[PDB]
Design an enzyme around this catalytic site. Structure first.
Site, PDB file in Angstrom:
ATOM      1  N   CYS A 164       0.784  -1.348  -0.346  1.00 28.54           N
ATOM      2  CA  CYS A 164      -0.078  -0.177  -0.047  1.00 28.54           C
ATOM      3  C   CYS A 164       0.310   1.312  -0.084  1.00 28.54           C
ATOM      4  O   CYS A 164       0.322   2.339  -0.350  1.00 28.54           O
ATOM      5  CB  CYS A 164      -1.401   0.167   1.029  1.00 28.54           C
ATOM      6  SG  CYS A 164      -2.141  -1.380   0.937  1.00 28.54           S
ATOM      7  N   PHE A 215     -10.514  -3.897   0.789  1.00 23.63           N
ATOM      8  CA  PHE A 215      -9.852  -3.725  -0.199  1.00 23.63           C
ATOM      9  C   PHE A 215     -10.809  -3.332  -1.175  1.00 23.63           C
ATOM     10  O   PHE A 215     -11.840  -4.441  -1.471  1.00 23.63           O
ATOM     11  CB  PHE A 215      -8.661  -4.381  -0.337  1.00 23.63           C
ATOM     12  CG  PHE A 215      -7.358  -4.558   0.468  1.00 23.63           C
ATOM     13  CD1 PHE A 215      -6.761  -3.228  -0.129  1.00 23.63           C
ATOM     14  CD2 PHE A 215      -6.770  -5.815   1.480  1.00 23.63           C
ATOM     15  CE1 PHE A 215      -5.503  -3.472   1.607  1.00 23.63           C
ATOM     16  CE2 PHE A 215      -6.003  -5.715   2.275  1.00 23.63           C
ATOM     17  CZ  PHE A 215      -5.319  -4.622   2.360  1.00 23.63           C
ATOM     18  N   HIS A 303      -3.237   7.480   2.424  1.00 28.73           N
ATOM     19  CA  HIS A 303      -3.199   6.662   1.935  1.00 28.73           C
ATOM     20  C   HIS A 303      -4.275   6.162   3.010  1.00 28.73           C
ATOM     21  O   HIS A 303      -4.021   5.914   3.674  1.00 28.73           O
ATOM     22  CB  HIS A 303      -2.293   5.155   1.976  1.00 28.73           C
ATOM     23  CG  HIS A 303      -2.743   4.197   1.724  1.00 28.73           C
ATOM     24  ND1 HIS A 303      -3.109   3.555   0.497  1.00 28.73           N
ATOM     25  CD2 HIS A 303      -3.022   3.075   2.441  1.00 28.73           C
ATOM     26  CE1 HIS A 303      -3.535   2.269   0.839  1.00 28.73           C
ATOM     27  NE2 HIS A 303      -3.726   1.957   1.908  1.00 28.73           N
ATOM     28  N   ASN A 336      -9.934   0.528  -0.042  1.00 25.03           N
ATOM     29  CA  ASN A 336      -8.772   0.964  -0.336  1.00 25.03           C
ATOM     30  C   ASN A 336      -8.237  -0.260  -1.488  1.00 25.03           C
ATOM     31  O   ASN A 336      -8.348  -1.171  -1.656  1.00 25.03           O
ATOM     32  CB  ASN A 336      -7.989  -0.142   1.471  1.00 25.03           C
ATOM     33  CG  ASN A 336      -6.865   0.284   1.043  1.00 25.03           C
ATOM     34  OD1 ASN A 336      -5.730   0.352   0.397  1.00 25.03           O
ATOM     35  ND2 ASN A 336      -5.251  -0.415   2.589  1.00 25.03           N
TER      36      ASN A 336
END
Lengths: 389, 389
Positions: A164, A215, A303, A336
């Site tokens: 990530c 995710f 992020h 994400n």
């Protein structure tokens, strides 16, 4: 005859690297997070696990994610029942999906970026391709080169199994490629597909379960270059510096292993606490040299590993409640998307700034920071400069 | 306040990137190629296949390899019998070996390079880690950082699943990192361990068999930096340019897939023919700007993918029979160590040049070329400048 000193001066580029264009793409199907616990426990045949489902409902409701785009459909899962188990051998089937879909999605994103850029594809000199979903030889960089019809002799950097933080890494990479090479135009693509990590639930591994809640899929593409051609190219953000560090004593905070059952995920201790405890040090290393001490005067890209990370960073640094609006928006609308996330946030930020008529691409502010967070507990820190709108 | 234009001029380095140190390492156990056909067909329980064994004998005898270093021992194979079959699920067992051994071997090479460099480990600012053996998160770059005790904040680039051309890629990468960053010292490590590809023989897949005859283990490390501190650091080779291209219509020439049975390799048609047909075009693109047309006046480093590649390039270009001595020497003593090969050859060349009292690190010659060959049929072409002895 010829001198290497003169060669070096001629082959290097002039000013700071700039993002010249941004494009994004996602798989067609978005699943509403409100609907995902019922869906997930159904297609994984886990409806028996009432206790576990209640935890996952909390996870999804807490996630601050409204929807995610997913290449994986119920129909594809029906064809691949070993993907639905927590642990069944399925690496080959997942690879078969992802070695094709990752460059395909990446091409969709790249074509959009190239459309905004407006220059011929043949002017692209470099390609940085990044993914955490699947590996192959030749790589996705090669496949994208063929799909797009880029010049042979495009200089490729294939970044596999990154994690990530790599949205920051590809920016760090493109910066050096663009700035050190006079006519360089760098195509950057991050393409992430969760078919490699999707799996059923295990009461022994609740951390894997949170991954199932967070995710999603997506690809983002940039054109990066120094010395924009006047009247033809238009910088959106300029890069000033790019750093990377390993957070102290964070050893197994985020691990991912590629096994016969696909990519496994381990997420342990206070990842939000670890990031929050340490982030001001990265801020200071990046901005003290610029004489900047008020972090609310920066435009922010972080992020969105999970909402707890954003909340605890906000509280620690004392950010005004709206500073992470752009970042929370893509968390909400996309989930994400690993390495691609931060690039979606750049696109969100410059689009919103234009529509709200701020004076610049960075919410009206001059200086900004972009953070990638990932395994190692690695943090990437990129200092950005906005451009007048 | 401060202007990004001046910051940029201050933060970049001045001159061309130079290799400041080289170190190499291998696993302790070397197997004599004369003994390998008997050994291999024995530990894979394939002695019944007498026909295939004779073919493999021809392959090993043709390989021009005298020995290879191998992490895989008979003892390890006995503990991992699923690795000995041509096709048995074994990815987990191979990952378990290689995620540990690859950075371990890389550390050995790195310690040797750092010893020659003679500067404190803390002065390393960047790390480029390359392997084709296994993947993990965090990667081998993180592991090496921890093993060596590099500064956190070392800027890392993890190059996974690259293939045999990547010796060139890491040079290309290190060049831009060193040249675009004023105090940068780049640790470069290529580490290759064939436990991920070792498997038993199959009469249906003779191309897999040639891999069993050619691939060996090894790691190489460089320190790369611009603006060497005079009297303290000593350039060995300087980089002038670095290119990469995909050879025309060479689609599936070299493929490798990471599957449940480990890393499989496919090697089709005339790889030596495809390379030889096209290599002069890369020479001309690299050396026409320097006014160089006599390719025998260059010192040569070529990835020894196999002796047939070397023989056919030599014949096509009209190279003197001794031009590829250094490359053939490391093929002879180490076999094909994938991405690390070319770096071992740089070491061989400067060591031999010194012992023969040539005027320079490149066999007495000023200019040189380094070639990496791999999947895509990708060729990496790096122009080198030697240093006075």
């Amino acid at each position: 005859m010829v001198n290497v000193e003169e060669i070096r001066k001629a082959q290097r580029a002039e000013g700071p690297a700039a993002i010249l264009a941004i494009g994004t793409a996602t798989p067609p199907n978005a699943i509403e997070q409100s609907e995902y616990p019922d869906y997930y426990f159904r297609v994984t045949n886990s409806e028996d696990k009432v206790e576990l489902k209640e935890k996952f409902k909390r996870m999804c409701e807490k996630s601050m994610i409204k929807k995610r785009y997913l290449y994986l459909t119920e129909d594809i899962l029906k064809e691949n029942p070993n993907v639905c188990a927590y642990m069944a051998t399925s690496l080959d089937a997942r690879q078969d999906m992802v070695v094709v879909e990752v460059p395909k999605l990446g091409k969709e994103a790249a074509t959009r970026a190239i459309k905004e850029w407006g220059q011929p594809k043949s002017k692209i000199t470099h390609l940085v391709f990044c993914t955490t979903s699947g590996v192959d030889m030749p790589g996705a960089d090669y496949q994208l080169t063929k799909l797009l019809g880029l010049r042979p002799s495009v200089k490729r950097l294939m970044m596999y199994q990154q994690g990530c933080f790599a949205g920051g890494t590809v920016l760090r990479l493109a910066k050096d490629l663009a700035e050190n090479n006079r006519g360089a135009r760098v195509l950057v693509v991050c393409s992430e597909i969760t078919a490699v990590t999707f799996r059923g639930p295990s009461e022994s591994h609740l951390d894997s379960l949170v991954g199932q809640a967070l995710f999603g899929d997506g690809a983002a593409a940039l054109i990066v270059g120094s010395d924009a051609i006047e009247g033809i190219e238009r910088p959106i953000f300029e890069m000033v510096s790019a750093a990377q560090t390993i957070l102290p004593d964070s050893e197994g905070a985020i691990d991912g292993h590629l096994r016969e059952v696909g990519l496994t995920f381990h997420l342990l201790k206070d990842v939000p606490g670890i990031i929050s405890k340490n982030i001001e040090k990265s801020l200071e290393e990046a901005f003290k040299p610029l004489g900047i001490t008020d972090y609310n005067s920066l435009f922010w890209i972080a992020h969105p590993g999970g909402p707890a990370i954003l909340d605890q960073v906000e509280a620690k640094i004392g950010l005004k409640p709206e500073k992470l609006r752009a970042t929370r928006h893509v968390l909400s609308e996309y989930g994400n998307m690993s390495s691609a996330c931060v690039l979606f946030i750049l696109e969100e930020m410059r689009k919103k700034s234009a529509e709200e008529k701020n004076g610049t691409t960075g919410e009206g502010l001059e200086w900004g920071v972009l953070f990638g967070f990932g395994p190692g507990l690695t943090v990437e820190t990129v200092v950005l400069h906005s451009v007048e709108a």
